[PDB]
Ligand binder design. Sequence first.
Ligand SMILES: O=C(O)[C@@]1(O)C[C@@H](O)[C@@H](O)[C@@H]([C@H](O)CO)O1
Ligand SMILES: [Mg+2]
Lengths: 112, 119
Amino acid sequence: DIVLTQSPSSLAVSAGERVTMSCKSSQSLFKSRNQKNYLAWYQQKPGQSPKLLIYWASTRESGVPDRFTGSGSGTDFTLTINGVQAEDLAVYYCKQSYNLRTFGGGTKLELK
Amino acid sequence: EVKLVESGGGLVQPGGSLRLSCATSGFTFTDYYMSWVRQPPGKALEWLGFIRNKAKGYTVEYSASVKGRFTISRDNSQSILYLQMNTAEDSATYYCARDGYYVDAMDYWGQGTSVTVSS
Ligand SMILES: O=C(O)[C@@]1(O)C[C@@H](O)[C@@H](O)[C@@H]([C@H](O)CO)O1
Ligand SMILES: [Mg+2]
């Protein structure tokens, strides 16, 4: 029963500044086989369907702006938004795919 | 252009059953897994389960929360995914999403369908 804790629950910043958020897993999501971290980040704008931003911890999905950067491994992962845009107002979920799938609590980003 | 479209949601009452549908296109349906993820109003995303692709044998997996009550089917000739819900907490928006062991993530999502519960 894997548990992913995201921190903080919510945060607010101005457009143009840098933010980081944490995704800690109760179990290692690293597979020695292919040497991959089975963690992914999802962006969910208000009232809209979730979108895949990053997979394998650090791999950016096609079309995703470079200002989004995923990092970390094992049990500690981080999502960094370098120069937040208004479009970025959304809830960001980390999700383990190491065994089946499990979503984190999510981190809600506000843009004031 | 990839497409996922959910439908078959509305008002029901606990113990009852509801059939959810997810019409797909824009990709080789049988090559990918297919997951169902729900989201209670103002709450987190929850993975319900998926059904593997061709090479894997179309076998299914479930979350302990819905395992048993829910069942997942797919139509390899029409490319439509199904969520057969059986039997207050299940209320939510229901998304079907393309999954698989390629990126190990859901790289494509539908627009969801609302499921409420009122006596
Ligand atoms: O259950 C699956 O078939 C699956 O292959 C999904 C993959 O994303 C991956 O999670 C895999 C497990 O990591 C076991 O290898 O299970
Ligand atoms: Mg893709």
